[PDB]
Amino acid sequence: NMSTPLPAIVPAARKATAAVIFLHGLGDTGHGWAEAFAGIRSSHIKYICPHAPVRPVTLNMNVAMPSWFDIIGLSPDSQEDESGIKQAAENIKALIDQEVKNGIPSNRIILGGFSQGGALSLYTALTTQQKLAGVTALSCWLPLRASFPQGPIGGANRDISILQCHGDCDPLVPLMFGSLTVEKLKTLVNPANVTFKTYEGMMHSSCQQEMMDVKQFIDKLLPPI
C-alpha cells in the first residue's frame, strides 16, 4: 500500500521558535489548510499540516478516502473507533516529538485541527504528557468522552488554552456536538482558558473571521522571542 507523504509546510521567515500542527478533516489533505494558515502566518512560527492516510470509512460504505480514523456515525451516541483514535493519537504524539528535536520545545507548539482533525487534536492534547501551548479545535468534537474520569485530568496539560470554533448552520458536525464538547472540556481543564466562538451563517467550513480569531489566539500564546 501507499507510503506516508511528507506534511505540507508553511516555513518560518525568521528562526522558528514556535510551531502549529494542524490536522485536516475528512476526505482532505494538508494542502488546503497549509495555504490557509500561510495567510495568517507570523515570522517565528512553523506551520505543519500532516496528511491523513487513505482508508475505508464505515460511515460511507467503507469507501476509501483520507481519514484519521474510522467514522461509524454522526451522532454523540454513535459508536467510535476507540482503537483507531488511540493509534492515530500516537502518530500525532510522534509528530510533536519530531519538532522538539528540531529545537522547538513542546510548550511552544499549538495542536489544532478541523472536524475529525480537530477531534484528534483534543484527544491527543488531553491524553499526552507533553506539555503543549494550546489547541485550536475547529468545528469538531471530543472523541471517547466517556473514557475521561469526571474530575480534572491533571498532569502536564491541566491549564492548556483551548479555542473552539463552530458554525451554527453546520449540517455535518452540528453546533450541539460542539457545545456538548466544550461543556465537557470545562470540567477537564481550567475553564478560564477555554473560549468558544460561534459563527452565524457558517456551515461545515471556515470563515475569514474565524481565521482572524485563530490568528489572535496563536499570537497571544506564541509571542516572539
Determine how many CB atoms are found less than 10 A away from the CB of residue 119: 29
Long-range contacts of 145-153, Cβ-Cβ distance < 8 Å, separation of 24 or more: 145/181, 145/184, 147/82, 148/184, 148/188, 150/187, 151/187, 152/187, 152/188, 152/189, 152/190, 153/126, 153/188, 153/189
Nearest to 203 by CA among 72, 114, 75, 70: 114
Question: Is the four-CA dihedral 41, 175, 120, 24 of positive or negative sign?
Answer: negative
How does strand 109-114 pair with strand 63-66? Answer: unpaired
Q: What is the resolution of this structure in A?
A: 2.8
Domain boundaries, the chain: 1-225
Is domain 1-225 annotated with CATH 3.40.50.1820?
yes
* Residue 49 vs residues 3, 9, 20, 99, 167: alpha-carbon distances, Å: 16, 6, 8, 13, 22
Please, which experimental method was used? X-ray
DSSP letters of 85-108? HHHHHHHHHHHHHHHHTTT--GGG
- Kindly report the number of other CB atoms within 10 A of residue 27's CB atom: 15
Could you list the active site residues? Answer: 115, 170, 204
Q: Are 148 and 188 contacting, i.e. CB atoms less than 8 angstroms apart?
A: yes
Specify the DSSP element, H or E, that contains 63: strand 63-66
> What count of residues does the chain have?
225
Nearest to 194 by CA among 174, 211, 178, 171: 178
> Angle between the 116-125 and 82-100 helix axes, to the nearest 10 degrees?
70
| H-assigned helices in 174-224 | 175-188, 208-221
